[PDB]
């Protein structure tokens, strides 16, 4: 990613319970996935926890 130039980037930062770290994956469903936040299946981006 150091060798690519970006058109535009968005940074979404928020607090998650230790056990729910794998709920933000595309296609993955659950309580916070369905009622709080979920991202499109064809998502291009990197996650840092």
């Amino acid at each position: 990613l150091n060798d690519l130039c970006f058109t535009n980037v968005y940074a979404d930062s928020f607090v998650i319970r230790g056990d729910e770290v794998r709920q933000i994956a595309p296609g993955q469903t659950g309580k916070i996935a369905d009622y709080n936040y979920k991202l499109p299946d064809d998502f291009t981006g990197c996650v840092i926890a």
Partner: protein, 48 residues
Amino acid sequence: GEVFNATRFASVYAWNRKRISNCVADYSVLYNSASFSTFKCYGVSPTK
């Protein structure tokens, strides 16, 4: 109910099986009661 929270689960060497049939199946009421960390499903999406 009996498969999500029993007195004590049968060991892996003598794992418990029963046929379930002639009823209606839904996950919403009981999944959140016993909260889980590894749900990986192969043939079927949880919503379908």
